[PDB]
Design a protein around this ligand. Sequence first.
Ligand SMILES: Nc1ncnc2c1ncn2[C@@H]1O[C@H](CSCC[C@H](N)C(=O)O)[C@@H](O)[C@H]1O
Length: 257
Amino acid sequence: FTSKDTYLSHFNPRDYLEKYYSFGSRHCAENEILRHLLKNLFKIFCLGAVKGELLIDIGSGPTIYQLLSACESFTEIIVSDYTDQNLWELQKWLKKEPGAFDWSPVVTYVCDLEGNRMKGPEKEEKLRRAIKQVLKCDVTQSQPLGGVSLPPADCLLSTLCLDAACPDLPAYRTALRNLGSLLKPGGFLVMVDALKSSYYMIGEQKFSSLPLGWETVRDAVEEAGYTIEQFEVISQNYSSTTSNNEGLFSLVGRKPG
Ligand SMILES: Nc1ncnc2c1ncn2[C@@H]1O[C@H](CSCC[C@H](N)C(=O)O)[C@@H](O)[C@H]1O
């Protein structure tokens, strides 16, 4: 329902970050989902065979939480979003500008997950150096990155994006196919999204969401042309004032050879 143009005028990066990614004493349900996402991303990127040279994050928004473990496994990262103001928000953090969002408590939490073998600033410096380009993307487009000239990627990452960007299931499958064009044969697809979510709130701003159950997600990914290597259902809901999701999933898919 929510048109991509509504993002351009109505998506507020800072409101989004405070609601979802602040690690406060308030926003508990959001905090609990974030902890669970970070644990699953840690397992995916640090405990397995998900490694390579170039990772492309699709629909990054104004967030870097989804890259914190990934940068230990990929030395080159491209971040991308439909919304120019989300990109400025990432650029702020990338270049250590005043007004950049404070990721400190999330970085510390990831460093913990990873055995306190490094300090927060080392992790930040690594992630910053890894980010090779910040790009406009549109998942609905046959060439999602606008035909910017890139080598085939080793991994595509997409967190909490495709459900928001797709009005129905054929659109979802098409987005997955469009993304596939960026990925090398044998490459990895890593996705996180809400289950059975029809909306999410940013303050008073309501954004639509494609409500899918886990069986359907799995089928759609297989039908979009990938093989499923890992799949998890997360039993956590956002706040009643935030969303009507019934859990989330994380998955790892593979593009055929
Ligand atoms: N058609 C489209 N193509 C690419 N990104 C889109 C899109 N429509 C919406 N988006 C992006 O999808 C995001 C949903 S919020 C998810 C942000 C982030 N990856 C996280 O894990 O929290 C927004 O940043 C929005 O700009």
